[PDB]
Amino acid sequence: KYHCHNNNKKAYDARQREQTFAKKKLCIASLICFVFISAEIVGGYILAVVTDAAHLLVDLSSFFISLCSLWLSSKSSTTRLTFGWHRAEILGALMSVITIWLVTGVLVYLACERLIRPDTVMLITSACALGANLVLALILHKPQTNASIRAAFIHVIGDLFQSISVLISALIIYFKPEYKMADPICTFIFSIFVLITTVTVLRDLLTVLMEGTPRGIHYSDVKQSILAVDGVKSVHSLHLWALTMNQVILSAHIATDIVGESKRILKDVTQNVFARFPFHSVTIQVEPIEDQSPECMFCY
Amino acid sequence: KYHCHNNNKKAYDARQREQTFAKKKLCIASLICFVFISAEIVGGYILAVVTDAAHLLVDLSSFFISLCSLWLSSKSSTTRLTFGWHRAEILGALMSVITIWLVTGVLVYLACERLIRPDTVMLITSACALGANLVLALILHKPQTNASIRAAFIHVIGDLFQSISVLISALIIYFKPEYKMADPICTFIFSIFVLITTVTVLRDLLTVLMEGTPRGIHYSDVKQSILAVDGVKSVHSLHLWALTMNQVILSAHIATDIVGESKRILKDVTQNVFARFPFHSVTIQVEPIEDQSPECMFCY
Ligand SMILES: [Zn+2]
Ligand SMILES: [Zn+2]
Ligand SMILES: [Zn+2]
Ligand SMILES: [Zn+2]
Secondary structure, three states: OOOOOHHHHHHHHHHHHHHHHHHHHHHHHHHHHHHHHHHHHHHHHOOOOOOHHHHHHHHHHHHHHHHHHHHHOOOOOOOOOOOOOOOHHHHHHHHHHHHHHHHHHHHHHHHHOOOOOOOOHHHHHHHHHHHHHHHHHHHHOOOOOOOOHHHHHHHHHHOHHHHHHHHHHHHHHHHOOOOOOHHHHHHHHHHHHHHHOOHHHHHHHHHHHOOOOOOOOOHHHHHHHHHOOOOEEEEEEEEEEEEEOOEEEEEEEEEEOOOOOHHHHHHHHHHHHOOOOOOOEEEEEEEEHHHOOOOOOOOO | OOOOOHHHHHHHHHHHHHHHHHHHHHHHHHHHHHHHHHHHHHHHHOOOOHHHHHHHHHHHHHHHHHHHHHHHOOOOOOOOOOOOHHHHHHHHHHHHHHHHHHHHHHHHHHHHOOOOOOOOHHHHHHHHHHHHHHHHHHHHOOOOOOOOHHHHHHHHHHOHHHHHHHHHHHHHHHHOOOOOOHHHHHHHHHHHHHHHOOHHHHHHHHHHHOOOOOOOOOHHHHHHHHHOOOOEEEEEEEEEEEEEOOEEEEEEEEEEOOOOOHHHHHHHHHHHHHOOOOOOEEEEEEEEHHHOOOOOOOOO
């Protein structure tokens, strides 16, 4: 009694732990961020206007989309969306990365306008921003890393460079009142670095959305595993795609010389395929060797 | 010699015509839009009209992403991205819809600021904007509509309402100099309508990106078609998802009572499945009746 669902539990329990573990850190980070929100209010009474609220507001806002997607991803499979809502944490994480591009562009425009209209508080604001951001970096931070932690961490550590830039600009100005042109150019030399560290995340997250082969698995390795069976002769129209970052699905065709005894081949191939990676699901068809064609364009 | 690729040509030639036909209209629209761009330059020599023509700038830009995606979608399938770049026109169209939300939000901010700082050229600018936009509506505008024409059309016809709002505001002010508060509120009553007509596009385009069942096909109808075969007994873990708007893929399990004679079942089921809809591809496994289990967390 070899049911085809026997090996699917390996990728079921591993996923369950990841979403519970991920929900633990964001809730801790959200509360820690909320504590530092009240610090600005306390300082407002005792100067009063500080721009740290804008940076901290989007950070807390970016920590509610990910919790919402993780809360939403637990829904049951339906007639529509047959695979389930398990891809909702890719779209949820993509919106977080988009915020970094939009936020940076706004600050570039404000820094650019300093040229046409040139003009202790700077030091204290930079210290608070560089303190809160650095703390959350450590709090946030074999199977590949979660698609949501890999986005929230980039958001927190991406904006740490902006706090570095203002500290350098304020320190130079406070010691040298002249050469005020360094402040507008200080942001430009550091605004690019935020746009560079978010490139390896966009590429690793965009190929999933167009059902490309995910990192950690190889097309050539999987093809060799199937061919180890004696019965199989050739594989065509192989298909690998990742439903999420650490869940993969397989689909293929298999050609065998013997028209009969096809029941035995399915048990051996499915067992051999699962002995290399925990697959979310696998669907393997069997075609007799007579039905193969030499020069089909779809076959290649 | 019933090759499994025989019926895949039905959904191959139909797709080929759609991308060639779609590339014909955008090129015509881009040139027509370019002609009206030169009208702004001609009027510049002979008055606060560049701002009116700023709307036409993003429209031409929005018509280059779609042509780029259609140019890019023709690339060959590779080891990575096994299915191909055929989903690049969903991501390309999604970015066009996002532009509508960002552009509208900017115009709301400028219209909102009129309250704090109240303050023939309006008529001529509105006439030109309402003329060019209306012409492109007709130029742009059974298988479902293309995912790129359904986005470019919404962009052109979405911003026609903004040109309507300025015409109403200018006409009322020109006749009644007083009651200047109608101009700031004129945009608000018409900025919402742009955000409403773009909702049925976002939903119909987002469920494709999370591999949901596309419009035009039904889960219950497909399940009944398979069961018409005498051999098949039960189907579990059915899976439908749309690679693009008018291309669908099928994957299922089939349980049969007779352990032998499985070669005949595959030919009948595949022929019967293709006689309801032109599928991009189909992969059907066969499982013996013994391997079925009374209950599972995956079968249901
Ligand atoms: Zn099964
Ligand atoms: Zn073929
Ligand atoms: Zn085949
Ligand atoms: Zn089962």
